[PDB]
């Protein structure tokens, strides 16, 4: 859990958008990822600091279906420690995962969510979404953007839940490639 701690210190930041509080994962250089619904647009507050967003790309699959992830490029001289080696090449399930949440209201929280399983299609508030996974844990509002981690891997970003189960967008390394 010193890997989760390293991630927390170096790569996981408390942020806010017009849609409220979220956890943000910095991946490399000036590149970070958020849940799509956070809708950062042209700026974002990182630990209360107002920062320009140079580009926001909402990811879709080949079929043009929502993946519920937004890649943001930040206007800063700060580079995130490169964690691409910890992101699997294929969307991966895991046993006994930890959900890492870090927002102003929920700072530095490690939440064991149990096993993460393939789910796939998700009707997320009427928005057809692909490539999701599921955990049998009652995730709550304010936890979107939380980072799903396992044995030295970063496998998902929290995006939704029904009060009983939680769902993440799966991560694959190629999402973060340079060009
Ligand atoms: C995180 C963002 C936030 O807190 O929004 C506050 C309104 C949040 C986490 C969940 C809240 C409840 N438990 C969760 O872990 N995500 C959301 O609220 C999104 C929408 C939902 O999660 C819906 N749940 C489902 O649709 C659903 C379907 C199944 C089989 O299980 N759950 C709501 C009905 C609660 C926010 C969102 C994302 C994308 C969109 F297009 C619209 C809205």
Any descriptors?
monomer; 179 residues; mainly beta; Thrombin, subunit H; six-stranded antiparallel β-barrel; six-stranded antiparallel beta barrel; 1 helix; globular; binds the ligand *[C@@H](CC(=O)OCC)[C@H](C[C@@H]1CCNC1=O)NC(=O)[C@@H](CC(=O)[C@@H](NC(=O)c1cc(C)on1)C(C)C)Cc1ccc(F)cc1
Describe this structure in words.
It contains one helix and twelve strands, in the order H-E-E-E-E-E-E-E-E-E-E-E-E. By secondary structure, it is mainly beta. The chain folds into two domains: 1-11 and 81-179, Trypsin-like serine proteases (Thrombin, subunit H), CATH 2.40.10; 12-80, Thrombin, subunit H (Beta Barrel), CATH 2.40.10.10. A six-stranded antiparallel β-barrel has the order 1-2-3-6-5-4. The chain has a six-stranded antiparallel β-barrel with strand order 7-8-9-12-11-10. The relative contact order is 0.21. It binds ligand AG7.
Give the topology, please.
Elements: H1 2-11, E1 12-17, E2 20-28, E3 31-35, E4 43-46, E5 49-60, E6 66-74, E7 94-101, E8 109-124, E9 127-135, E10 147-150, E11 153-161, E12 166-170
Antiparallel strand pairs: 1-2, 1-4, 2-3, 3-6, 4-5, 5-6, 7-8, 7-10, 8-9, 9-12, 10-11, 11-12
The structure holds the ligand *[C@@H](CC(=O)OCC)[C@H](C[C@@H]1CCNC1=O)NC(=O)[C@@H](CC(=O)[C@@H](NC(=O)c1cc(C)on1)C(C)C)Cc1ccc(F)cc1.
The site of ligand AG7 has 16 residues, from strand 8 and strand 11.
Family: Belongs to the picornaviruses polyprotein family.
Subcellular location: Host cytoplasmic vesicle membrane; Host nucleus; Virion
Domain Peptidase C3: 1-176
